[PDB]
Amino acid sequence: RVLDATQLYLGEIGYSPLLTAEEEVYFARRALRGDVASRRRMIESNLRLVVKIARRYGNRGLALLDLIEEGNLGLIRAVEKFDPERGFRFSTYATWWIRQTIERAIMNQTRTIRLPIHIVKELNVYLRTARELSHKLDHEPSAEEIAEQLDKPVDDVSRMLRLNERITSVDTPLGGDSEKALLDILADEKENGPEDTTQDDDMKQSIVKWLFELNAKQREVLARRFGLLGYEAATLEDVGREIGLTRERVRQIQVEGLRRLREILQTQGLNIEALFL
Amino acid sequence: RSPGVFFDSDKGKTHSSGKVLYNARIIPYRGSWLDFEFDPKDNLFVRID
Amino acid sequence: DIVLNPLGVPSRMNIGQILETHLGMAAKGIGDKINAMLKQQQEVAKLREF
Amino acid sequence: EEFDAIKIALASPDMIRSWSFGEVKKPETINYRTFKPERDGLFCARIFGPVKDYECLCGKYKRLKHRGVICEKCGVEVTQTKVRRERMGHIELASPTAHIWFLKSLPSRIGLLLDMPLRDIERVLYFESYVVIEGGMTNLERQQILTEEQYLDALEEFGDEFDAKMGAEAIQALLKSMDLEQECEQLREELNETNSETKRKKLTKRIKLLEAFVQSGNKPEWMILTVLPVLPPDLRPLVPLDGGRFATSDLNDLYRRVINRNNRLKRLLDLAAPDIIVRNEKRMLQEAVDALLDNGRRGRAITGSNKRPLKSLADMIKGKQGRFRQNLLGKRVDYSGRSVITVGPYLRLHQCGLPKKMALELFKPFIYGKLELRGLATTIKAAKKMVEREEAVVWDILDEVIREHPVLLNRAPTLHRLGIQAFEPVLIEGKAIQLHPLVCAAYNADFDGDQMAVHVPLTLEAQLEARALMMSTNNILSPANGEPIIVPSQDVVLGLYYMTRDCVNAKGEGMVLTGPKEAERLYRSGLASLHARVKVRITEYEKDANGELVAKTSLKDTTVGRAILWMIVPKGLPYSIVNQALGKKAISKMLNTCYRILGLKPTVIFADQIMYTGFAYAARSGASVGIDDMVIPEKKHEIISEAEAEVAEIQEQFQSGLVTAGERYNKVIDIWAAANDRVSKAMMDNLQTETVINRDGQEEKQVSFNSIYMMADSGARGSAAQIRQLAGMRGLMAKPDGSIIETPITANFREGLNVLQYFISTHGARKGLADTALKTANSGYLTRRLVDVAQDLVVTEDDCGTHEGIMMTPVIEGGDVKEPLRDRVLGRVTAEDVLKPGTADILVPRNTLLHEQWCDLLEENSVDAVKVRSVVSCDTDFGVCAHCYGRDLARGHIINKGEAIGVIAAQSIGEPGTQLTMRTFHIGGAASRAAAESSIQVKNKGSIKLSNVKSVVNSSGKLVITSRNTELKLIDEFGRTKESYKVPYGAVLAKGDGEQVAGGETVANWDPHTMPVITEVSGFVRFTDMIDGQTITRQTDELTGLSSLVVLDSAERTAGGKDLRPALKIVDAQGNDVLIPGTDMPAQYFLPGKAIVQLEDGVQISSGDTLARIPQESGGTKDITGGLPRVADLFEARRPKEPAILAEISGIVSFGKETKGKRRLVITPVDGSDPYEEMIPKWRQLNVFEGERVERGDVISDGPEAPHDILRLRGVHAVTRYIVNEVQDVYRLQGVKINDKHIEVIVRQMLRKATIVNAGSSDFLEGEQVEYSRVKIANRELEANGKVGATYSRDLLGITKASLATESFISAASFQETTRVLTEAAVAGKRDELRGLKENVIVGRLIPAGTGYAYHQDRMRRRAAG
Amino acid sequence: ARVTVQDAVEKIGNRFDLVLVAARRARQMQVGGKDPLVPEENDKTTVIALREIEEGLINNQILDVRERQEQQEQEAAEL
Amino acid sequence: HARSTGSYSLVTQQPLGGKAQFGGQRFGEMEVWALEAYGAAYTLQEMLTVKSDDVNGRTKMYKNIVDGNHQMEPGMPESFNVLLKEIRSLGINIELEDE
Amino acid sequence: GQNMRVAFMPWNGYNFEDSILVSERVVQEDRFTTIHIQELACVSRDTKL
DNA sequence: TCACGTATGCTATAATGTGGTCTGACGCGG
DNA sequence: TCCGCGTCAGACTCGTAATTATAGCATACGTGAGG
RNA sequence: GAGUCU
Ligand SMILES: [Mg+2]
Ligand SMILES: [Mg+2]
Ligand SMILES: [Zn+2]
Ligand SMILES: [Zn+2]
Questions:
Q1: Is any Cβ of chain D less than 8 angstroms from the Cβ of F21?
Q2: DSSP assignment letter at D895
Q3: Which CATH architecture has domain D627-775?
Q4: I need a surface site. Which of D709, D1156, D1353, F70 has the fewest CB within 10 A?
Q5: Beta-bridge partner residues of D894
Q6: Nearest to G16 among D343, D616, D623 (CB)
C-alpha cells in the first residue's frame, strides 16, 4: 500500500497504453467525430506527458499536483481541437497546450491580490530585460536602467515593479521560536479608541447644547444647512426649500450664527487654542 | 558534530530490560547517513537516513 | 563617591571586589603621594626614587 | 447579551448555510489598482459587508440617511463595518470531504462509531479500495473492503446486487445507512454471553456513544462535510503595511487552495473527464480542507513562502498561543505601565513611590474629569492640551485625584497572590518606582534592576477591593503558612542585632538609668556603648484575663541599646522580648507575637518602626567587609595533610585490589566530607569565641564582633555554609550529573582557587545556572496543573454538619520532633470531643476553633494525637464548608464564605517548588550531602520499643534485624514517644526489645554503603541457577586465589538465563534443605542485580551471617530538582513499578497452588465464605507467613504503596495521609512550609469521581463513573423516598485527568488537549453552564466567588423564583 | 480606614460583604450626592464609606432601612 | 513606560504590546490567579473587559471616569466573539443557550 | 567605565538589596554621563492618491 | 458604436511514472 | 511490545524587513460616453 | 534571532 495522493495517481497513470502514430489518428478520427471510448483512452494514455511538463514548471507558484490538474485540462482541449487529417503528431500539438494552460493559470492563482494577464506579461518583459542588463552592469538593473533600455516611462517601469513586491503574512513571527508576529504590533485604525471615541461624543454633545444657545432662527438656518440637525446637508441657495426661501437673508443669518458662536469659543477658552486642532 | 564514524549506545533508554544497544553512524559532509544498530535479541540492523 | 552594601558580598561569594577595592585604594594612595610631590615640586631625583 | 449557558454540537449542512450571508465562489481578494472587495471573492463586500461605516462600494448610498438599504448597483448593504467580523460565508463543495477532527482525533469517532479501522477508512478516502455500503445479497459483507481487482469480480458476477463505492461519498453513505437504535440493542444483548474486560469496555463505550449520539441530536452524516463555512474577513484581514506592501492571514492562503480545487472539480465534473483525473482532484480537495481545518495532523503540513507551515483554524484555538491561553485566560490591559524599581526606606508599609509622568499618563480620564468640575477646561480636547503642556494647575489636580486612590503593583513571576499588592501612591521626582523594603520578600524583588507592573483600579468597587483585600498592610501573614511574610532582612536585622547584643564593660558598665530615654541620652551624649551591661528602670504592660492591660515596673539588667529598642515596642508585649540579642528568627517571632496579642494596626506600625531603627542603627554601626574579616584557622594545613593521607590509604589499597571502585568512591567522599566539617568547626570555633577581652576585673571572653560573623550569625545575609567557601574549605563540588566529584577543592575564596580548582568549580556553576533556566519550567508546570484542578473550589457553606476528620499524630521523625502536634492542628475545628487524659470531663468542644490559647492547653495536658475536621471529609456537595477548612492562615481568623481556596492551595504548593528551582542554583556552587547514617545514638534514657520488627539472634550474640521497615521509639517515664528513628535491614542492635538504655548510647549499628542479605537459618550454602556466564561472573587473584561472584541483572544478562532466578539456597550437613522455623519454606534468599558474593559454594554458615552485599550508590545531593518529580508523581497518582501487595478482605489466610514459582493466595474470610484469589510473583519474599488473621490493607509484600490500593482498602482518610505525608516529607527536606490543608484541598479534587457498582434508580446502572457530588444528591432522595439503592466506590484520579473529567468543557479545552475536548463535547452535545472561575474569566464576567460570591447567588435565586 | 480597614471588617464580618456595602455607600455620595455622616476631613468617597462602617453608622441592614425609607416615602406620595 | 488608552490589535481588539508600540501590560493567567485567590472579582473583571477587549466597555468607562462616576458598565470580550466564529468555521455549532 | 572611592557600610537602607547610593559629585562631574546618538528617518513615498 | 481594461484563444519537429532533514523526553493508550 | 500523540513557568527590551517566473499577439467580453 | 528579572 501507499497512502500518499501523489504516488497513487502516478501508479494509476503508469499502467496506461502508450499510443503509437496512426493509433493516435485512429482514435482521434472517432474522437472529433465524437466517441465515448476515444476521448478517454486518448486522454487516459497521454497523462504521462502532462506529468513531465508539469515537473519542470514547479517551485514557482503552485505545488505539483496542482500543475498536473491544470495540465490535464490543457490535454483535454488538445484532444477536442486535434486534426488527424494533418500529418503532424499529437505529442507535438499537445505540448503547446500543457505548457500554455499551466503558464496562463499560474499567473492568476500564484498571487494573493489577483494579478491580470497584461500586467504580468508586461512585467516579464521588464524581468528578462533585467537579467541581460545585469550581466553587463554587474549590480542589479535600476528601474531607470530598465525603462531607458526599452525607452518607456520610468513611472510605468516603477508601477509594474511595485506590483511584484510579495505579501508578508500576519502570522509570520519577528521573534523566532514563539515571540510576537505582525497582528501583535498592527493596530485597527478603523475602530477609534476610548479617548478618540469620547472626544467626538464631547465635541458633538458640546455642540448639541451650543445649538439651544444661539437665537431660534439662527440655529435653525445654520444647523439644517451643514446637516447637523436636519436630514440632508443643504447649501445657501437650498435652505430656501424649508421656510427661509431667501438667498441674501440666508447668507447673512448663517454667518450671523457663526460670528456669535466664534465669540462663544473665545470666552469658553478655545478659538486660537483649538485652531492648531 | 564532526563528520566521520562515531560509535554510540543507548544505555537503558532502549527497551525495558536495559540491554545496552550499541550503534554506529557514518556521517558525511554531504550525502545520506548510514546507521548500524543492535536489537534486544542481538541481531544487527541497517538504516539509511 | 559610592556607598555599597556589605551584605551584598558574603551571599554572592565574589570576594574579588573587595581585593580590587583594597588594591585600588593602595594604587590611589601612590597617585595621591605623587600628586602631592608634583604640587610640592620636590625633585626629579626624588620622584625617581619613590 | 446576558445568558445562562453555551452548547456545542456538529454543524448541519443546513446550519452552515444559516451563518453564511453569501457563497464565496472565487479565490480573488482585491483589485490591484482600485483596492476594493472583488465580485464574490474572499473579501467580498456584497457578502460580508462594506469597508467604511455605512458606505456601499460604488458610493451611491452614504451615511445614516440610508439606514437599512441594500445598494442595487454593487449589491452592498449600507451598514456598520462591524458586520465584516460577524457575518460568515460558505462554499458548496462539489464532493463530500471528511472532517479531520472526527477522523484523526483518536478515538476516531467516525471509525469507533462504524466499528471499522481508521486504516480501512483512509483507504476509501484516498481512493485505494472500495468499501461495501449495503451488500444486497449478504455474499458481500458490510464494511468489507474490496481492492480495485476485487471490485471488478463482483461487478461482472453480481452488478446491482451490491452497492460498494469509494471516496468520502462512500463513508458518508456508510454513516447514513447505519441505524443507531437497532445496532445499540444488538450490542447490549450480545455482551451477555462473553463479559470480559476489554470487550465490555469497548462495547460499553460504543453503547455510551450510540446513546449520546441520539440524545445530542447529532447525525453521523455530519462527520463528513458537504458544506464548508468561511471565516469573516476582519478576522483574517488583508491590511496595508505603511509603505505599499500588504499583509494577510494564513487562512486566506488556505481558503484559496480550497476554492481553486473546488471550482476546478466542478469544471472536471462538467467536462465528464475520466475518473483517474476526477479522483486526483477529490484527493486534493480532501487535502486542502484537511489543511484548512488542522494543518499538521493528517499529513505533512502545507508550507507557504517562509518554509514554516500555514497556520490553520485549529491552530488559533489550540494550546498556548491559542485564543484560550493567550487572549482570554489572560489579557493586555489599559491604565498600566512599569519601570525599574528602587528602595523607599522612608516610605510607610502602605505606600510606594509612583513617578510624576507615569501617574500623569495613568490617571488621564480622572484629571479631565476634575478639570471640568473645577471649571478650568471647557471640553475634553481642551483638557487634553492642558495636560499635554503639563501646566502648573494640572500637577495640583493630579495630586488631588491620587490621594486615597490606591494603585496595584505586580512582579514577574506571579507565583502566589502576594505577587500583587495595593499601595497608596506617593508622587516622586524621578522616573523609578520606589518599593517598601518589607514587602520585598513577597515579591522576591531585589533592587539589582527588577521591573514592576502598575495597574489603576478605576471603579469604586476596585478602589475598595484594593484597599480592603489587596492592600499591603492587610496582607502580612503568608496564606501558605500562618507566619508573617512581612519580616525585616539585610540591614534591618543587622541593626537590631548590633543594638541588642552586649559586650564586656564597654563605655559606662553597671550604671543605673531612669528609663529608656536616659539610655538614649547616654548613647547620643557619648557616654555609653549600646553594648554596656546596665540596670535600667522599664515599665512593661502585660495583658490581664480581661481586655485590660496591667502595668508593671521593674529594674532590668540589659544593655543601653536594648533599653532604647523598648521605645519601638508597643505596650502589650513583655520586655523579655527585647532583652535577648535579636536575630532574624527572633524578630519574626516579635511581629507574630504582636499580631496575635494586639492586632493589625499595632503590628503595621511596630513593623515600620523596627524597619526605621534597624536601618538607622545598621548605618551607625559602620559594619564592613575586609579581607582580614575572613579569618582562616591556623590548623587548616594540618587537617588537610591528615585527611590527604587517609584518602591516599584507600587508593593504595585499591591498587592492591583489596577495596573496589564503588566502595572507595563512597568511602573517600565520607573522609573528605568529615574533613570539610572539621575545618569548618575549627573555623567557626576560632571565629565565634575568638574575641578575648580584658574586663575591669581581669580577663574573659565573649562572642567575636568580626563583621562577617555578625552578618551570618544575625542571619542578615549568608550563613555558615557560605563562610566555609570564604575562609575555610570550599568542599566537594557536584558533577553536572549530580554525583559528587572525588577530588574536592581544599582552598577558599580568600586564599584563591588555582587554575584546576576553578575548572572543577565551573562544572557545578553551570549545572546550577542550567536548572535556573530549564528545570524551572517542570516546576511551574506543576503550579499550572494544580491550579486547573483546584480552580472551581470555593467556601460555599458555613457548617456541613459532618462529624468526620483525619487523626493527626505529631511528626516526630529522626531524634528531634520535626513538626509538633500544635503546629499541625492549629486553626482547625476539633472533629470529636477531645478531652484530657483522665476521660471524666470534656476539655474541648466539637465545633470550635483552635486558637494559640487552646493549643497551649493541648501541650499542658499532653494531648498526643487529635482527630481534626479536614477538607477531604467535608460532605458539602457544592464546595467546602468554613469549619472543615478552618482559619485563613493569611488572616489568622476563620475563613470567609466566598474565598477561593482551590487557587490559594495550588499556589502555596506550586510556588516553593518554582522559586527554589531558581534559588540554591544561582547561589549554589558546591555539593553538601552527608548521608553517612552509620549508627543511631539515643539521647534521653528510655526503654527500647521496636515496631514492625522481626529480628533473629546471630553467632556473635547480637540481635540482627531481618525486616525492612523497622522503627525505633524512645519511651519516657509515663509511656509516650519522644524520639523516633529508622533502623534499617541487617542492622545490629545493642539492646533488643524492651531493654532499658542510658542517654548517649549506640542502640543500633550498621554499614551504610551496602544492603546485606542476612539468613534466618544455619547450615551450608547451595548455588541454585548460578550458572557462570549466563546469570553471574567471576574474577580471581594469585598464589592462593580468592574469587568473588557478581550477579548480573536483565541489563548485563543474556537471553539464556532470563527465566533463571539466582538464589543462595540453605542446606544442612547431609545436603537437604533447612526449613525456616515454623513454616513450610525451604530456605532460599533471592539475590538481585549487581549483588557481590564473597562466600563461594559449600561454605558453613550460622543464622545472622551476610550471604551477599548489594551496592548502595546514591551520591546525589537532593535539591528541589530531585524530589519534585516525586511530588508530581504523587499528585498524579502513579502506581510505582513494584506495588506492594495488600489484603483486600479481613479473614483467615490459606496459601494455595503455584505456577512454576509464581504464588497463588486462595484466601477464605471467616464471614465472607466466598474466596478471593490473586497471583503473586516468584521473587517477592512475603512478610506474612500464611494461616493468620489478616485484616484489610495489611502489608503482604514489602515495598511502595499504590495510592489506589490505599483508598480501595483503607478508605479516604488513609490515602489523604499517604499523599500529605509523602509530599510534605519532600518539602520538609528543603525547609519549605506548606500547611497540610493545602495538600488536602487538591487531594479532595483527586477524590472527585466514583464508579457505580450496584444498579441505581436513574441511569447510572453499572460501570459509568460519575462525580461523588451527583450520586449523593440522588441518594438523599433515594434514602427517604425509596427504590433501588445505588452502591458505590470512590475512585482516585491524577491532577491532569481530574481537570479533564470536569463537566465544564470550557475548563477542559482551556487546560490542555484542546483538539480532543472540543470534539468529544461536540459529539455528546454537552452544555457548559459556566460554573467555575475559568469559565467566567473567559466570558469576561464577575467571578462566582470572592466579592462576586454575593452577586452570583443573587442571580441564582432569580432563576429559582419562577 | 485610612491605611487599615481591619476596624471596618470587625464591624460587618466578611471582607467581601464589606467591599459591597462600602461601594454601595460610595456610589450614593458619588452620584446621588448624599451628605456624609462623618466629617469629610478631605478624603475620597471610598474612605468616607469605610469611616461610616467603622463607627457603625452604615451597614447592609441599615442601608436597606434607609433605602426603604426614601423609596416608600415616594411610594406614599404616589398612593 | 505608561499607558492609559491607546491603539488596539486588529483581530483580538486587545491593547498593543511594548513601549516600542506604546502598549499596555500583559495580565497573564498567573496574574489572574492572584485576584481569583484574594476574591477581588471586580478588579479582575475590570482588567478582563473594559481595560482589554469590551469595545463598549472601554469607551463607556472612559466617559464614566471623566464624568467622575467610577461605574462598572461591562460587556463581553471581542476575543470570545472571535473564539465563537473560529470554532464555527471548524464546522462546530457553538451557540449561546440563554436564560 | 570609571573607578571611584567606594565605602562598604549600610546607610539607612538606601543600599538595601544591592541598591546603590552615589554622591551628587559623581553626577556633577558628568563622568557617568553617556552620549546616545539616535537615527530617525523621514520617507516621502507614493500613495494611490 | 468607440474606448478601454480584461479575458479567451491558439502555436502541428518530436516530446509520454516524482526527487527537501537527517537528534527529545517522559507518559499513556491501542 | 511498538507506534503515535500530548504535555513541557511568568512577564519585559531590542531588531530588522527576502525570492522567483510565467511567449506573444488576435479576436472575444463588459461598461461607459457621445452622436 | 541578542538580551533583562526571577
Ligand atoms: Mg534577592
Ligand atoms: Mg534581581
Ligand atoms: Zn453601491
Ligand atoms: Zn465540612
A1: no
A2: P
A3: Orthogonal Bundle (1.10)
A4: D1156
A5: D887
A6: D343
